Amino acid sequence: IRLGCNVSAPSGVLERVKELMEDYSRAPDAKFQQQFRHLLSVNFEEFVAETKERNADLDWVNPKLDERLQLELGQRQLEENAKKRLEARKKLPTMKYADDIIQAVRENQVILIVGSTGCGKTTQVPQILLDDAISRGCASSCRIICTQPRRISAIAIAEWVSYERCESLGNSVGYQIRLESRKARERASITYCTTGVLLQQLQSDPLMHNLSVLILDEIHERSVETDLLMGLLKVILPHRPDLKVILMSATVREQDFCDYFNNCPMFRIEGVMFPVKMLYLEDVLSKTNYEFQKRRMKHEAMIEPYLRRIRNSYDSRVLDKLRLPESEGCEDIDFIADLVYYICENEPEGAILVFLPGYDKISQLYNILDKPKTSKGQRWRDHMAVFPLHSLMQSGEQQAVFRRPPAGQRKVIISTIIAETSVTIDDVVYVINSGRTKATNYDIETNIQSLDEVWVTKANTQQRRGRAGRVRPGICYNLFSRAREDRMDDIPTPEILRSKLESIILSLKLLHIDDPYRFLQTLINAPNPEAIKMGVELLKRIEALDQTGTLTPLGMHLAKLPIDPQMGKMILMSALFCCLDPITSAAAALSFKSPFYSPLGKESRVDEIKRRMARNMRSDHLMVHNTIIAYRDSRYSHAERDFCYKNFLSSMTLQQLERMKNQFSELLYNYKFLASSNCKDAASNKNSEKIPLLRAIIGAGLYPNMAHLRKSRRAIHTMATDDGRRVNFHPSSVNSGESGFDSAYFVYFQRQKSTDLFLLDSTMVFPMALIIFGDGVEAGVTQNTPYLCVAKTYYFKCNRETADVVIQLRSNLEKLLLKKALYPAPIEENGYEKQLIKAIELLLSLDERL
DNA sequence: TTTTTTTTTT
């Protein structure tokens, strides 16, 4: 027990908080209290019972619009422009099986279509059953949902199949993604949507009565959502015989899904392309004849049994060179430089997509490609058009990366794994695949997750292979030996095994599945129950579950919000404490991403501007809200895309960040926590310029994540989390390297690792804020000097009667919080509950340092 | 002194 700074408050100010809390304690309608107790009362069978008669709308169909529409395409499938595709999309592999697949679903509730890309499973399999449904006179019975892993896919596929039916978007074809939609007609419709839309909709339709048939696409990539989804239909389908499911997969361990539903009918469907042929690096340096210069027992246990088998098909110095390991992978960047320098002379016109693990090495091969020191490269410098591709760089949102190059120019793209699925570039005939990328890896023991460079898996090299295909024959240069391919895993660790489960075990209670261990162990891969429990314990600590593990009324509010519970709780507190707009900003950035790019060479000069937008508040999260305020003031000032370029920000990210804030705003007003659904509305923001208060609500979200700084000196810091480990601020964070902070304590959303240990994001907090909103407060005395602690961890001194008033104020803040969850209502500014709020504002305001 | 990547109703 070593003690810190002094939080005591003047006695004149405590006499005033004491009068407001005696005021609050003389206080003497709820549908929500009912719907909560209604849900704890009910078991799973009446749960299934009651929800049946609620969503009946697909029990009803409309004979005449059935009749009208089946004559309406039935007549004009012979007047001509449509049926140029009725002929032209039997081009694509899937429509050989149109009737084969129709019959299959008629006799099967769940089927599996395996196909590789270009077959058109998702383009058409939906329209085969709608045009079938319409043709038999079933039109209004039929409403089909087709789920996709990413947003842009859902839009593009919808907008493209829309246009194939000579309909504008919004008639028989639609898409719905979060906070953006073109909804199709309610019946005889095709709706594409992200996997997460349909899980949120499960809360109001747990047994999926509002769709006739569901199609789950790209399950082979094992997103959490699709794994969850087929997990919940083993519960859902028993009670819905007439619901039809169509699984859709690439051929990537296709038969896991076939085995997970009984042994399911499976449709294998043709690929479309020419080849893109594999060369491994024993083929690459057969042709490049490069050499290098500026663990080993296994490399050598791996390589030589296999060079003893390829002995005659290559020269002795090429098989000699599988034995330096830095041959394979990214270990030499001048090697890959000389391969792109190499493909430019030989091989016909075409694009080079180069896959490297991460952003550091996309820079170094960028620098080598545009600033070659070798006279062989200085030739090519200006006859290559070089694009960095990364989540954090601008080139992914412009149209240039997808373009054809200037005549006489050859386009080279140096990309992370983003180019495998997320981003698609159609003119690539050449892919160079390092085989190395980066992956989150966590150690449940240490509470460290680190970001480590890893080998890819077979499943990925085969899809980067495909990327070199779609326009004419490509070739795929993989920089590892074939001996290395046989040792990689089939597919990457499915994400549910590496995910925080806080949000899912909680949301699962709305579907009335209250044993996580029972249910989550029924998925294709069962999460480790120590993750399941480490999730249960975090929701018991923010008190979304009581200590029996049962949903509390605050938990039921947070399960409904589309954000992690920690941050859902932070949104709710910001409604009660009247800073709605700042805090939703923080919340929105943490569950999504920061608006800031970091283009190459501007690392130096994207960190000035993050600092100028922090306004010396040394809060990563309010720095984003400052940026957001700046972004609409550019939309009123109409300084528009000027503004977004000066400051290196994503037009598209801010569009979404601002749309989520109104989503949070709109649900809290629906939930009767706010009087206005406008998140900038005055009544919701009257504390929004009080910075000490905003860090208290920020700490109220990220608690218990805390760090302390003992160092003065840019500067170097000596810092520790509550975990005991020594930490520093990530360099991308704004609190990296400064000095003279007004508080020695910080809260953080995520701590992750390369070279040290880092906090990716932080806000300086004052000790008093943590006392009020945290836990682990006891009063006592250390030597003989009086103390008040937080988390039983950071012990600060305290006066005794500041102690009792905060302790009694935490007791009143807790019971107010519990009633506010049970009986949602906005706090009116003149009521009794508001004088408990004023009491906290006044205590927190003492930390404005003037 | 650093940056794998998705994504959430009415």
Q: Which of residues 78-137 of A have CB within 7 Å of strand B?
A: none
Q: Which two tokens stand for residue A270?
A: 């043709």
Sort strands A110-115 and A266-269 into parallel, antiparallel or unpaired: parallel
- In three-state secondary structure terms, A179 is coil
Q: Whose CA is nearest the C1' atom of nucleotide B6?
A: A150
Contact A8, A799 (CB under 8 A): yes
d(CA A416, CA A394): 14
Residue A443 vs residues A440, A530, A674: alpha-carbon distances, Å: 10, 12, 41
State, as a whole number of angstroms, the distance between the CA of A504 and the C1' of B5: 20
Residue A118 dihedral angles phi and psi, to the nearest 5°: 105, -10
List bases, strand B, within 7 Å of protein CB: 1-10
Virtual torsion, Cα A132, A135, A137, A142, nearest 10 deg: 30
Alpha-carbon distance of A689 to A579, in angstroms, equals 8
Which pair of tokens denotes residue A358?
């991460």
Q: How many CB atoms lie within 10 A of CB A93?
A: 19
The nt closest to A450 (CA vs C1′) is B4
> Where do runs of H (alpha helix) occur along A637-674?
640-646, 651-670
Q: Is the CB of A360 under 7 A from strand B?
A: yes
- Selection from A214, A98, A195, A201 nearest residue A154 by Cα: A195
How far is Cα A820 from Cα A826, in angstroms, rounded to an integer? 9
3-state secondary structure of A623: helix
The alpha carbon dihedral of A729, A730, A735, A737 has a sign of: positive
First to last CA, chain A: 31
d(CA A711, CA A757): 16
The bridge status of strand A351-355 relative to strand A410-415 is parallel
3-state secondary structure A409-428: CEEEEEECHHHCCCCCCCCE
**Å from the A209 CA to the B10 C1':** 14
> And the tokens for A727?
């930490």
3-state secondary structure (DSSP) of residue A188: coil
Does residue A128 contact residue A95 with C-beta atoms inside 8 Å?
Answer: yes
DSSP state of A528: P
Q: Which nucleotide is nearest to A714 (CA to C1')?
A: B1
Strand B reaches within 7 A of the A588 CB: no
What residues form DSSP beta bridges with A37?
A: none
Q: Which of residues 638-667 of A have CB within 7 Å of strand B?
A: 663, 667
Neighbours of A127 (CB within 10 A): 22
Confirm if A110 and A247 have CB atoms less than 8 A apart.
yes
Dig out the tokens for A219 from the structure: 């399950």
CB A466 within 8 A of CB A277: no
Count CB-CB contacts under 10 A for residue A689: 10
A717 close to A609: Cβ distance less than 8 angstroms: no
Query: 3-state DSSP: chain A helix, strand, coil percent, rounded to 5?
Result: 45, 15, 40
User: Which residues make Cβ contacts (< 8 Å) with residue A139, sequence separation at least 6?
Assistant: A65, A66, A69, A70, A133, A187, A188
Closest CA to A187 of A177, A204, A174: A174
Convert A406-417 to b/e letters by CB count within 10 Å (16 or more is b): eeeebbbbbbbb
Structure-token match 């981003």, residue found: A423
**For B5, which residue's CA is nearest its C1'?**
A418
CA at A812, C1' at B6: how many angstroms apart? 41
Helix A333-345 / helix A359-370 crossing angle, nearest 10 deg: 50
Q: Whose CA is closest to A438, among A457, A462, A420, A456?
A: A456
Give the Cα separation of A155 and A161 in Å (integer). 10
**Planar angle of CA A259, A264, A269, nearest 5 degrees:** 105
Residues 222-261 (A) near nucleic chain B, CB < 7 A: 223-224
Residue A691's SS3 state is helix
Handedness of CA A531, A532, A537, A539 (dihedral sign): positive
**Cα Rg of chain A, angstroms:** 30
Residue A7 main-chain phi, psi, to 5 deg = -100, 5
Beta strands in A766-845 (DSSP E): 779-781, 786-790, 794-797
- Please identify which residue in the block is written with the tokens 């943590």: A770
DSSP classification of residue A183: P
- If phi > 0 it is left, if psi is from -120 to 50 it is alpha, else beta; for residue A561 that is beta
CA-based nearest residue to A30, from A567, A737, A672 = A672
Distance CA A214, CA A662 (A): 30
Please give the structure tokens belonging to residue A189: 């419709």
- Please state how this structure was obtained: X-ray
From the C1' of B8, which residue's alpha carbon is nearest? A562
Which residue type, as a one-letter code, is found at position A12? G
Do β-strands A719-721 and A706-709 pair in parallel, antiparallel, or remain unpaired? antiparallel
Q: What is the resolution of this structure in A?
A: 2.9
CB of A758 within 7 Å of some strand B atom: yes
Annotate A449-506 with DSSP letters as a single string.
EEEEEEE--HHHHHHHHHHTTSSS-EEEEE-S-HHHHTTS-SSPPPHHHHS--HHHHH
The answer to whether A23 and A832 are in contact (CB under 8 A) is: yes
Q: Distance between CA atoms of A821 and A792, rounded to whole angstroms?
A: 27
Report the alpha-carbon distance of residue A351 to residue A28 in Å, rounded. 74
The two tokens of residue A361 are 């090495």
Check: CB of residue A747 under 8 Å from CB of residue A702.
yes
A499 CA to B10 C1' in angstroms comes to: 28
In Å, what is the separation between the CA of A94 and the C1' of B8? 31
* C1' of B6 to CA of A826 (Å): 35
Contact A356, A415 (CB under 8 A): yes
For A619, the token pair is 């809060």
Distances (CA, A) of A511 to A223, A227, A534, A588: 20, 16, 21, 25
Nearest-CA residue to the C1' of B7?
A196
- List A746's β-bridge partners, or say none: A707, A764
Which residues lie across from A764 on neighbouring strands? A746
Give the residue among A782, A772, A773 at the shortest CA–CA distance from A802.
A772
Chain A 800-819 residues in 7 Å CB range of strand B: none
- The residue among A775, A767, A846 whose CA lies nearest residue A810 is A775
Could you tell me which residues come within 8 angstroms of residue A224 by beta carbon, excluding any fewer than 6 positions away? A495, A496, A499, A504
Nucleotide B4's nearest residue (CA vs C1') is A438
Residues whose CB is less than 8 angstroms from the CB of residue A691 and which lie 6 or more positions away in sequence, other chains included: A617, A622, A848
Whole-angstrom Cα distance, residue A127 to residue A109? 18
Nearest to A553 by CA among A325, A822, A774: A822
SS3 per residue for A562-585: CCCHHHHHHHHHHHHCCCHHHHHH
**Residue A600 exposure: Cα atoms within 13 Å on the Cβ side:** 19
Residues A541-577 as b/e (b if ≥16 CB within 10 A, e otherwise) read: ebbbbeeeeebbbbbbbbbbbbbbbbbbbbbbbbbbb
Distances (CA, A) of A243 to A111, A194, A236: 12, 20, 10
Name the closest nucleotide to A180, judged by C1' and CA.
B9
**Contact between the CB of A179 and strand B at under 7 Å:** yes
Q: Name the 3-class secondary structure at A98.
A: helix
> Strand B closer than 7 Å to the CB of A422?
yes
Distance in Å, residue A665 CA to nucleotide B8 C1': 15
With H, G, I as helix, E, B as strand and everything else as coil, classify residue A432. Answer: strand
Q: How far is the CA of A496 from the C1' of B10 (A)?
A: 28
**Length in residues, chain A:** 850
CA of A802 to C1' of B7 (A): 45
Is the distance from CB of A664 to CB of A679 less than 8 angstroms? Answer: yes
Query: Is A424 within 7 A of strand B by CB distance?
Result: no
Rounded CA–C1' distance between A180 and B10, in angstroms: 14
Chain centroid, CA A72 distance in Å = 42
Q: Is A556 helix (H, G, I), strand (E, B) or coil?
A: helix
Residue nearest to nucleotide B1 (CA to C1'): A731
Length A390 CA → B3 C1' (Å): 10
Which one, of A132, A171, A139, A142, lies nearest residue A63 by Cα? Answer: A139
Q: At what angle do helices A565-576 and A553-560 cross, to 10 degrees?
A: 110
Nearest to A499 by CA among A531, A530, A454, A524: A531
Chain A residues 280-339 with Cβ under 7 Å of strand B are none
Q: After which residues does chain A break, using C–N > 2.5 Å? A: 28, 294, 713
Which nucleotide's C1' sits nearest to the alpha carbon of A559? B8
